[PDB]
DNA sequence: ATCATTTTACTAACTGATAGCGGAACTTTGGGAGTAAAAGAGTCTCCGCGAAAATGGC
DNA sequence: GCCATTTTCGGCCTCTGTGAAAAACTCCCAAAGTTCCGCTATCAGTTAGTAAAATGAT
């Protein structure tokens, strides 16, 4: 199996799972630990943001690759926004200070 | 963009500040038109339009009317992704 | 309910052996085929049987 | 989609010096994810160097491995400099060679 | 809900009739409970009369299956109900309760149905790149025209502007009338159909 | 730039209308007619001659070039 | 194993309160007490006295200053309730918090980047 | 609440919990409008409290509310917590593109 | 999860504390030698020659194979080396108190997530685990 | 082509700093119009930057110096306008 | 350099069509009130888990 | 200080739709919905006509 871009989850806005759904591989906790041990910060950021759930970031990355500029503009994962909305729904004020 | 995450109790005024409206009915969608019901759990007047730059009426159905609230329904003409934030 | 017509198509696929296929005996010795070597590169006995 | 020959030449030029990431589950230690230079082969199975098998705890009895493509220049250089197999020949747990 | 119905029954009881309280109160309690079930038992609310129609259809289906030993067919149910078959099918297609997204899928327990639902409203990045390329190609092709016809087409189609314009507003800026704008757009379309400057735009079809 | 209609050589309205006399078809025929015929028409003039020769230069040809085709 | 044992020995119970903003019988981080003692010594004021406590890996993990990592580890309900009642602030100083919020981890190639930001912080706070 | 193939609809348990909360709140308002006997009002307030608790954290107060699957409904606390929760299934680990 | 926050943040914290290192003895024979334990550690106080005041190995020097052979030839019994536990760094540890990074062979670089490496190294072999 | 990033880490000292410097150089050569200081030999920008670092032509000092130089030159040119 | 002609730029008009908006009337749907023998305490099954720690009660 | 009841935890990949039961009619009224017709805005298609610019011939 192999996937570059395809369907995405309805809620988490993440690539689906399985060959039947043309889905992508899971970069689990152990993989994140291995990348952190290597010191590979940029590869980890690529997997987290512009490959999984940064809706604007992944589209910008696709356009940039098509036009030759292999650069990314990382954003905020949609999963963190879902977590924020859930915690606010539990009657707890969680907010990002600036 | 942000340097810290602050947690704490939520005041009723803060909860009202978050909210874009009050859900008054347990209705979700019509059983025939499959459209959101007013003042329900899926209301387009509170949470946003179901189609991009459209209103439930269909009167405002293009981008020139962005940010305009339809008088017949009250649905703001904007993107559907606001239904993930509102 | 709501279904008008169902058309089912049956496809027969001939799958040949290739590298990556799992082959095993009856004694727990399983393996994955690594190379499809030519006949001339196989070991052969005194009678020429590879 | 039509799979022309010039497309194959373009693919060969694309992956020339583009590192690729190979990962085997479970990733007990950081040696379970490494960077390699791809070589196009005719088949459907990933060909792996024997000497990294001890690093991957991998044997060829039905094992499957996942592959990832670093996109940005920073990620490619991270794979080439830190995560390449030629750099990871000492065990971080003890310092003894791992490609024995 | 039965307590509310009992309150109503108390509010409109008559002891002069000589009947016991339970006789009158049971009707109101049953009405309240049945109406509450019809109104608040489904995620997608079905009106009360349609709920009664579904229930009576189920009762007749039960009786007919008992009578003949097999599942009644839509036509026979329509004949027995003295109702059109199309209405029977319409009623049969709406008696479904939504399935939960947390239901385990297959024989597994850590997998859920909600992980297999796509986001069909999303735009594929290939489509967005094609849109950007089409914008660039349209700009390049329109740059090969005189400013008059290029801007006439731009304003008549809304390219690089918020709103589309009819012939009158296009004519007003040029101070010319509508018919000249129409033939200007016709000339631009005829010129852009020439294959000398339309091969790049053809690949988008 | 083999045998293809004369509309493809993007000729102006007057140029095309004049040559619309059916005294030509396909650019292979046009390249062979020389200035003798090109200026013979009372409607093909100096500017039309220059424009046609510029189009043929874009085609890499000169008016009057002799080819067996 | 010594990098694990150091993580175990991260808390201290205050024995002598001193003039620092610490109460007797309070379990607080050792680094904060060390900085407070250095500041008090520079100010010529009575420093604090602490008794270091040994905690298991689970209790030390759940006793971190950042509540995002503690919630992500386990027992999200207790961590979130305590953070909400206390009004805690997450400064995003570890790997897990930056992974969750999608920023560069303060390890390896992100280290200098994070360092730069901290410098700017101080320079603006001036 | 999105349609599946065949006309079926897929819904989250949060919809059911919110519907229960809204129904009980509206019933409480109607009872207070009718000058109800005290016992019914106390029962309605208990039901409202139970619905809110089930919406926030199901099973902590008492018997977990179950739907038409004879299985407990998933609340916000269950959605943010656990091995299958958001933190460990979607934040610390993700499914990625450009992978095989 | 308990060691993810340990990152090498400085080069030297300027501390004089350290841990004592001697060959591990469990009877009449050695179990592990001093060379194995001292390989890759930074010296805390000078390794004086036995019965002599000559500074054989000065302070703040990594013990590589050459100095390990030197120590073995001199027959030095007890030494003192810097340790992560005794580090004075406010956040994380310093390069000298950690020592050689085993996966590279040189002194540990700035920004190395040594805690994750330590946790993985300890946890990976868990499957293999069960007077004269 | 090149393998075994040894010479580069010897010239730089830290692998992460080397990665950052090589990334900056590769971005300059790819996105920008900057040309390579060594024969390309059909190599990708990352490999060319790594080779330049190995040869000692590119360090952090050089990159920051010429970047400040470009800012100064652009300021002077805008003043000239 | 100058004249005569074709093409160009700009008005008007007719044909024919099509989509959108508003009003009248009819059928379909949807919400609500009412039902008078009397009937006047729930489920609802399970429970095949162990080990360690954090809170009340005395 | 010591029981005694709660609380929370239990490895990483890949495929892999479910659930299925369950009990009312009847009458009245207003609003949404379907269909039809008329008026109006807008446009594609075509022709004619007039005044002027481009252009070729001399
Ligand atoms: Mg195996
Ligand atoms: Zn509207
Ligand atoms: Zn130190």
PDB file of C-alpha atoms and ligand atoms in Angstrom, chain I residues 11-15 82-83 86-89 93-98, ligand 3:
ATOM      1  CA  UNK I  11      28.065  22.661  28.357  1.00  0.00           C
ATOM      2  CA  UNK I  12      29.395  22.943  31.925  1.00  0.00           C
ATOM      3  CA  UNK I  13      27.428  23.754  35.075  1.00  0.00           C
ATOM      4  CA  UNK I  14      30.604  24.420  37.079  1.00  0.00           C
ATOM      5  CA  UNK I  15      29.959  21.921  39.871  1.00  0.00           C
ATOM      6  CA  UNK I  82      30.598  13.701  37.194  1.00  0.00           C
ATOM      7  CA  UNK I  83      27.047  12.368  37.037  1.00  0.00           C
ATOM      8  CA  UNK I  86      24.788  15.548  40.828  1.00  0.00           C
ATOM      9  CA  UNK I  87      24.398  18.098  38.015  1.00  0.00           C
ATOM     10  CA  UNK I  88      23.815  21.723  39.004  1.00  0.00           C
ATOM     11  CA  UNK I  89      21.835  22.662  35.876  1.00  0.00           C
ATOM     12  CA  UNK I  93      21.670  18.542  32.449  1.00  0.00           C
ATOM     13  CA  UNK I  94      24.982  19.762  31.045  1.00  0.00           C
ATOM     14  CA  UNK I  95      27.302  18.131  28.534  1.00  0.00           C
ATOM     15  CA  UNK I  96      30.135  17.425  30.979  1.00  0.00           C
ATOM     16  CA  UNK I  97      27.945  15.902  33.700  1.00  0.00           C
ATOM     17  CA  UNK I  98      26.539  13.470  31.113  1.00  0.00           C
TER      18      UNK I  98
HETATM   19 ZN1  LIG M   3      26.447  19.421  35.186  1.00  0.00          ZN
END
